[PDB]
């Protein structure tokens, strides 16, 4: 029996950028519209947003991810059919999932996904029962991801990672 107890975390002063999508690098849906690559990727994601809405598939396309080691919280900028939204996640609630697990979570046959949706790097927030999907055409901060607080030696839990999400 796992209970969703909230700890009332807050952001720190200087975050460390870990993820930065090469596309959508600009700020604002207006900038995405005016940029050629951003507009086409947004159109390709329109079915992704449609799946979010009508198929009740909890997922988010994540860009510009930052990390706060002082409080151990990830700040994610997510792109939705309406614009860019800011979300906060606790490392204790974040676990990795296979792409097939992400697909099988939804009971509706998802539309044929685009080729820029990174299938390997799909993560799952257990507190929100949600999926985070990153972009293949992106840049990862090696020094940021090699932070001690992000190490599996500290963030690893067999029961949570392997037995928490049993889709069947």
């Amino acid at each position: 029996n796992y209970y969703n107890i909230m700890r009332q975390v807050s952001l720190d002063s200087n975050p460390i950028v870990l993820y930065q999508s090469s596309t959508f690098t600009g700020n604002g849906l207006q900038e995405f519209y005016e940029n050629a690559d951003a507009l086409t990727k947004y159109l390709k994601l329109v079915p992704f947003f449609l799946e979010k809405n009508l198929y009740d598939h909890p997922k988010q396309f994540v860009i510009k991810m930052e990390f706060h080691p002082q409080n151990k919280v990830l700040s994610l900028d997510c792109l939705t059919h309406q614009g860019v939204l800011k979300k906060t996640v606790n490392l204790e609630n974040l676990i990795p999932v296979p792409y097939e697990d992400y697909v099988q979570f939804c009971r509706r046959k998802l539309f044929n996904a685009p080729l820029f949706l990174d299938t390997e790097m799909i993560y799952f927030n257990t507190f929100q029962n949600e999926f985070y999907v990153f972009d293949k055409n992106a840049k990862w901060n090696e020094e940021g991801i090699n932070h001690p607080e992000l190490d599996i030696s500290k963030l690893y839990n067999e029961k949570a990672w392997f037995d928490s999400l049993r889709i069947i």
Partner: protein, 450 residues
Amino acid sequence: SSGNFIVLFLGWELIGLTSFFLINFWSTRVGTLKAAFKAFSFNKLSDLFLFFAILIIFSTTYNLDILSFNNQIYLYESYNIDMFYWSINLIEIISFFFISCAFIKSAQFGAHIWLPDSMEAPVPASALIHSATLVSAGIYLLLRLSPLFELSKYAYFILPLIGSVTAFYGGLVSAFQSDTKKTLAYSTISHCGFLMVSYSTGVLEFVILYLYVHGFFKAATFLCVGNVNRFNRNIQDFKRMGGFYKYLPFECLASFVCMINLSGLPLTLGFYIKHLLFIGLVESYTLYPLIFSSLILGAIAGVFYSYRLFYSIFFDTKKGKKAIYLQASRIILNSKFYSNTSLASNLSITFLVLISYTVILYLYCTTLNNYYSLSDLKSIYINNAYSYFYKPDYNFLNAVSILNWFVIILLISVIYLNWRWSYYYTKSIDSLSKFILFSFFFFIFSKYIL
């Protein structure tokens, strides 16, 4: 295809003996011999009844020809036979012996005890015996000697009651069954009960249609479950079967089609047989309440067993031994020839389904069409049941809706009902709410707003 009672009795004994051999195919085991001996004892009892009935017929009329007996029995209908201390009606006693042997060979209630044990035979033998070969001998007897039973008080009282009781019993036991062959056997018992009730209604065309539909689709389902059992290494219980849809793709879809047709479900070839049975059901019986309630329960029972069999075999969580899946999931096996079944088996099942569809359609056109083009049945008893098939009234049209909606609710239960915790519990309830509301709005638009 027997021309006289002697040839009929010969064929009766021959089917009994050959069914015994098929059941006892595994001669090395004595456990199989017990089931074979059970079937043998019941068959010998049926042979006794049939022989005694034939002797009575020969003593009355100095003739064994089937046509002559059928065209003469009405003259002797008024006769009685002086037995030990009672004067029994001749027609009643002859029909009593015939119906007893027919019940024994059709596995009606009480005499059905051998059929579940006869599943020890290999699946092809089981399919052949349980589809249209061994369990339809009583139906053939009734159809061939119908002029006798039309003047039988005992037949009138016994055929509907026993048929409905057997239908209910077989349907419910099949629904609660966990083994594939046992489920099919109890479904066969239920359908034989329905055949008895159809003959009681007295529309030989409906009886023939029911027989054809049941035989074809029962055989096809038996073949599919045989492939499933062979893949599962002779374990016939689906408690050890799960996630077989990918390992047996053809079996999954073939079983889906065959089961939806077998279990009378809306918008399928097998719905009309039950519809016609309920159209023809008679209402002058003294035990009509029990008969009708048992018939309704047996008819609805089809959904549960079909759903359980299909879902548990194919799309349930993997419950079988790790070896069953691993031995077949090896990458080395990936090839254009890869399959867990036989290509000849798949082709045989496909052709059987196609031919069954075509033949059932031909029979439906012959009988249920506006222009009646069936050949003469050589019977002078007209039941009036076709009146409610040609010009049904509002009362009957709305009465059928009760059973239709009962089946609908049962389908909704077997689909949306949760028995185990899942990640999709809340979303399943939400989907049910969406379906209900959308159904209401769709009906509103279809009927009124267009």
